[PDB]
C-alpha cells in the first residue's frame, strides 16, 4: 500500500476486441485541458497533416507522427489489466492535436511611408 | 629569427632556380613527384563492418579511379601497394 493515496480501483469496463488477422486498431491523440472532449461531436480525419478544427476559438491543427510504449487492456475486472500482444503490440501513426493560431500578417501599407 | 634560438620552423621555405631549356609543363611533373602526399588522401570513404562470433575484423577501403589518383598524384600500384603492405600494416 504505497503510497497512502485516496482509493484503489473498483470499477472496470470491457473492451470489445476481436483481433482480426482492414484491421481494428487503437486511436490516441494529444490535447490540452481546455478542449471539447464532451461538446464535440465530429472530427475530420485526413491524409498527412493539413487540416483545422472549427469551434468557438477556431485555431487547431491535427498533427501526425510516424516514429515503444505498452498499453494494458482490461479484459476483465479481477485483474483490471492485461498485456496487449498478437504474436507485444506496436503502433503506426500517433496523433497530437496542436493549436496553430493564425498570425495576422503582411500589412505593408502603414509601415512603408515615404 | 633574432632571439628565439631559430630551429625547425612552422613553414620552412627554399627557392630552387631552373634552367632555360626546362618548361612550365615539365616543372609541374617535378612538383607532383617531390610534393609529399598523404596516404589517406586516396580514399573515398572508410567503411568497416566489425563482426563478432573470437573477434573478427574486415576493412574495405574504397579508392579513387585510375585516371583520378594516378594522374593527379602520379602514383600507381607499384608504389601504393608496396606502402600499403609494408608501412600501413
Amino acid at each position: 500500500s504505497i503510497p497512502d493515496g485516496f482509493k484503489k480501483c473498483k470499477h472496470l469496463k470491457n473492451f470489445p476486441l476481436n483481433g482480426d488477422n482492414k484491421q481494428q486498431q487503437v486511436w490516441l491523440i494529444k490535447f490540452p485541458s481546455n478542449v471539447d472532449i464532451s461538446k464535440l461531436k465530429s472530427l475530420p480525419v485526413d491524409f498527412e497533416s493539413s487540416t483545422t478544427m472549427t469551434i468557438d476559438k477556431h485555431d487547431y491543427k491535427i498533427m501526425d507522427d510516424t516514429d515503444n510504449m505498452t498499453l494494458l487492456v482490461p479484459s476483465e475486472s479481477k485483474e483490471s489489466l492485461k498485456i496487449a500482444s498478437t504474436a507485444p503490440l506496436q503502433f503506426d501513426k500517433v496523433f497530437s492535436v496542436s493549436e496553430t493560431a493564425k498570425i495576422p500578417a503582411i500589412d505593408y501599407s502603414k509601415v512603408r511611408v515615404p | 629569427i633574432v632571439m628565439t634560438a631559430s630551429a625547425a620552423i612552422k613553414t620552412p621555405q627554399m627557392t630552387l632556380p631552373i634552367w632555360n631549356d626546362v618548361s612550365d609543363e615539365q616543372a609541374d611533373t617535378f612538383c607532383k613527384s617531390i610534393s609529399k602526399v598523404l596516404l589517406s588522401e586516396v580514399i573515398d570513404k572508410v567503411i568497416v563492418t566489425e563482426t563478432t562470433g573470437a573477434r573478427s575484423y574486415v576493412i574495405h577501403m574504397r579508392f579513387f579511379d585510375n585516371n583520378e589518383y594516378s594522374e593527379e598524384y602520379d602514383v600507381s600500384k607499384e608504389e601504393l601497394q608496396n606502402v600499403i603492405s609494408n608501412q600501413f600494416i
Binding site: - | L38, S40, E41, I43, D44, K45, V46, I47, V48, T49, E50, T51, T52, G53, A54, F64, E68, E72
Partner: protein, 64 residues
C-alpha cells in the same frame, strides 16, 4: 532486446556483460540470478563509417 552488439534484459531492467569475457553458454545478471541465456543471441555484426571530415585535399575541394 538486441541492438548492435549488445543484448539487454527485462526481468531486472539492465544490461549484461560480454558473453566472451566470461564463461560461455551460461551467463548471469549483476544484481540477481536468473535462468539465462538461451545460447541463441545472434551472429554479431555492426557497421562503422568515417564521416569524411578530416580528409582534406585538393581533389576533395574539386569534388564540391
Amino acid at each position: 532486446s538486441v541492438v548492435g552488439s549488445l543484448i539487454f534484459c527485462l526481468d531486472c531492467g539492465d544490461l549484461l556483460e560480454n558473453p566472451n569475457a566470461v564463461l560461455g553458454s551460461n551467463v548471469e545478471c549483476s544484481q540477481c540470478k536468473a535462468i539465462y541465456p538461451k545460447s541463441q543471441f545472434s551472429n554479431l555484426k555492426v557497421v562503422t563509417t568515417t564521416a569524411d571530415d578530416a580528409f582534406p585535399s585538393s581533389l576533395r575541394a574539386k569534388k564540391s
